[PDB]
Each structure stands twice: as C-alpha cells, then as structure tokens.
C-alpha cells in the first residue's frame, strides 16, 4: 500500500463517474500518472469510444510514485462501489506490478473501516490518439433537455438525425410506427444562465446516429449539468460532460451517408 494512493473526499464521485459509462464499455484500462487518471475504452461494436480524465484536483489526496495501469471490469468495480456510504472517504491503493487493487471506505464520525480487494484483469488494447479537430458546429445545452429529447425520439426509430443550421438544431427520428421532429432555437437567459442553449455555427451539418449509443451517452447527464456536442461534416461527434477537475467524452461514429 505504498505505490499508488488516491483519496477521494467523497466516494459518491467515483461511483457516479463509473455509472456514467459502465453500460457502454465493460473492460477498461485506467492509467494513473503523476497528473491524474486517464481511461480509454471502446465498446463491443467498435463504434463508440469513451474517454475519461480525472485530474489531481479531483482528489482529497493523490500520490503516484510511478505510472501504473489497471485493467478493471466495470461490473465488479460498481458492485464494490455500491458497498460504500455517501459520507465516506474512498481510497484507491495499489502496489508495484499489482494483481489487485484495494478500495478503502473510511468514516470519521464512526470508527469503522471497510476494505475491499478487486482482482485486476489483463486487457490488451491499443491506445488511439485522439488529436484535436476543429469541428464545424459547437453546441452547449442542459443535460436534462438533451436526455429528454433522446429518450423521446428513441422509441420512434432506431436512428436519430441531427441537423444543425443557422440558429436552429433539428432532431428527427422518422421510423416505422411513425416519425418525430423536435426543433431547438438558441437562446440565452440571464436570470437562469444554467438553462441557455448556446450554438456556435460555421458550416451546416446533418449527421445520423444510432439511438442506442445516444441512450448510453445520456446516462452521463448526472455528472454535468450542461452537455457539449461538437459536430463535423463526417468526423465522429464528441459529447462532453465536464467534471470539477476533468471530463467524460464520448466519440460516436456517424452512420455512413
């Protein structure tokens, strides 16, 4: 219990992060460096990529002697994380060349400790380098609105088409039983700055996406109040949820023209 020691002030934060994307990917590699934790995963269909960054400022304490990698099955990690109370400090502990990690739940008001050991998995995956790309359209909208739109349009068709044009965002879910259309107009309210719908628009874009991947993405709405969507002509759409110190990004490949 010397190499890696990462103390979350509240165990709920890590559980929320895991729940954000545990239903899209199953086996994830978390690399802990001297700056923080980075995780990259690809779903079974190789269509959706999940990126997670947690900075050093997101921990009550953080100490990593040497860079380490930990392969975890998110199901078991969530199973363990459900055993912690809301008002408990969490500690991830690892040693050199670890076969397992230690999750320690500590309570200060009560002298009770809960130590769990999670067996690590051997995962052989290639780290894809996600270079920055100047997207055509940028959008920022409250997470609740996007989640409601996606859940409403999902039951109509297996696919949802987003058309961003001058001062307009259109979601269409034409299917078999019927069709659906929702039009969002950018607007800003000073009384409630957390409700404004911001759109920076350069080139018109019309992209079609699978509904199941949007349904998986919207599960991250808890982490961030406002979700950002960056869209290009053909490059994968980037759905980002911010975190106190870090972010959770979803890269979704559009359906071919």
């Amino acid at each position: 219990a010397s190499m890696l020691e990462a103390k979350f002030e509240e165990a709920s934060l890590f559980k929320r992060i895991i729940d954000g994307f545990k239903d899209c990917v199953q086996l994830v590699n978390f690399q802990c460096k001297e700056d923080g934790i980075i995780a990259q995963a690809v779903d079974d269909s190789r269509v959706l990529l999940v990126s997670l960054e947690i900075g050093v400022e997101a921990f009550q304490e953080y100490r990593c002697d040497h860079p380490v990698t930990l392969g975890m099955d998110l199901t078991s990690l969530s199973k363990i994380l459900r055993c912690g109370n809301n008002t408990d400090t969490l500690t991830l502990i690892a040693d050199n060349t670890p076969d397992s990690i230690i999750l320690l739940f500590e309570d200060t008001k009560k002298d009770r400790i809960a130590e769990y050991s999670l067996k690590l998995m051997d995962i052989d995956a290639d780290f894809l380098k996600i270079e920055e790309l100047q997207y055509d359209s940028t959008l920022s909208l409250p997470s609740s609105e996007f989640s409601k739109i996606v859940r409403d349009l999902s039951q109509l068709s297996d696919s949802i088409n987003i058309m961003i044009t001058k001062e307009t965002i259109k979601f269409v879910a034409d299917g078999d039983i019927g069709s659906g259309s929702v039009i969002i107009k950018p607007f800003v309210d000073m009384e409630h700055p957390e409700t404004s719908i911001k759109l920076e628009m350069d080139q018109p874009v019309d992209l079609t996406f699978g509904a199941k991947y949007l349904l998986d993405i919207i599960k991250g709405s808890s982490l961030s109040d406002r979700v950002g969507i960056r869209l290009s002509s053909e490059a994968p759409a980037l759905f980002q949820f911010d975190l106190k110190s870090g972010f959770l990004q979803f890269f979704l490949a559009p359906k071919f023209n």
Partner: protein, 318 residues
Amino acid sequence: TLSLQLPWVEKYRPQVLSDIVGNKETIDRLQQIAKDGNMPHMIISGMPGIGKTTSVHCLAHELLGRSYADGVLELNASDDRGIDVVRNQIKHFAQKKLHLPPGKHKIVILDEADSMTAGAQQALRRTMELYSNSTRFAFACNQSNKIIEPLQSRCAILRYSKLSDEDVLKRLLQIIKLEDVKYTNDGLEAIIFTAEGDMRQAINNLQSTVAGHGLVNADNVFKIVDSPHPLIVKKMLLASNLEDSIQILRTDLWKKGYSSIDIVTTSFRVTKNLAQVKESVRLEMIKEIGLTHMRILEGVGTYLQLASMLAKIHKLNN
C-alpha cells in the same frame, strides 16, 4: 454413535502422481509435464474409479504449488456450468491477472465434462483459444464422445484403461500394511475379482469387510460383496439343458430378489457381449430378449415370461 470413520478411499487418496497405480505411460507423461511445465489443454477419459480426478488434481497441485488457491478453477457436475457461467465466470478467470512462475499457467478443471451442454462447450472454444497464453483447460469424463469435436481438436487426448489385477493387489497390500489388516490370499483374490478393475470399489469392499468381520477371507468377502449377477446371467444363457437354465433362473436370480426388468436388461447386455457365440445366433437371442423386455415393460413382469424367453433361446441354440 455419532462418530464417523474416514473412508480409506479418502484417507489414502494419492497426493502425488507417483502414488497412482496403473496407466504407467500416461502417469509418466503427466509427471514429465509437471516437472517441465507448459501444460496443454487435455481431456482424460476412462471408466469409473481408475484415477482420473486424482491424476488431474495431483497434476494441478504439483504444477501450481502455493498458488493452487488462486490459479485453479474447479467445476464439476455438482456446480452450475451453464452458458452464463462459461461466458462470465470462466472468462473472467481466464482474463484474471496473476503472476506465476516462469512456465506455469492457470488451470480450469472441468470434472465430469461429459455432462456439459452443447452450448457451453461451444462457448468454451474462443475462451480457450484467446487466453491460452495464461490459462489451460483440463477435462475429465467417462465418455469422450460427449465432448464436441471442436473442443477435442484443441485438447490432448489421454485415455485411461482398466487397472490390472497386479496394480489393484499392490495398492490393496499397501493399504493393508498401513492399516494393519488381517487377511488371506483367497480374500484378496475375491476382492479383486469382484472389483472388476475399479479401485474405489475394491477399497470400499475391503474396508467394509474389515469393519463387518475383521478377517479378510473369501467367506467374509462374499458375505459382504455379492456374486456379480451378470456372471449368473451368462451362466444361465450358456446352459446346455433348458432345465439347468430354468433352475438357475429360479434359484440364483428369482428367489434372490432380483427384478424381472433387471434380469432382462442384464441378459440383453450379456448376449450383446457374448463373443463366444456366432453373431447371427446372438441377434436372434437379442430379438427374443427384446420381445420379453417389451412384455415386461407393459407390466407382465412374471417368472413365466422369463421362463418362456429361456425356452425360446434354448430352441434357437438347438
């Protein structure tokens, strides 16, 4: 009395490959694998009570040393081995990270694998192929035919044969010397004859005889272990005169409490394995035995039906 004496089949279960009698070539190969390493996927098939589970467990123990608890996953018929189990638990065990000595791998022991469903066996194929660099699979079964061909292709087949009377005698004498058991040559001969190459049966019969009568002689052994009824049936079917066969049926089988269904099934099996008689005659006798078996299954399980079957067999053999 609330106490229990530990059975000798458990008290004297071999703990190393050197203590396993019979199948010298296979045990030597297992010993070489254990000494060297790089265990391949293997399937071990044989008849009951010859040392398959013992061999697999000894191999795993000697290969993995102190890492036995962490690097061995044992599943048998008494456990759940459905498609979900194969797809989740076995896969997780295969993907588990576990540092091991330079030439060792994790072992999955699927005992009595012949009872596994086709779907689970199909699911095992890619799990075996993908994680062969850290996990190896050992199957133990009684019927190798039940293992699907794709799995057999990926495994090494190590078939076990019935133990000879010499190996059984050696093991029995070792156990007798350890336990200080009073015995006579005829008693051991009877034990071996009734065991029919099943070491577990021989040891259990010896322990039962010692407990019930102490002295292990022919009389006590037969008082404990009954004469195999298949041999009585074989004598009945090969009798020269119909009167002798009927007498055997009435005295050695019917009056001993053997059911008609058991008698007819044993007759069918013995006639099937009666190489001394011509095949066509055996086929005719099997036809008659099948007629009688159908009649018994319809509910007429009387001694008259068996007598009629014997009479028809005698007519055929004339």
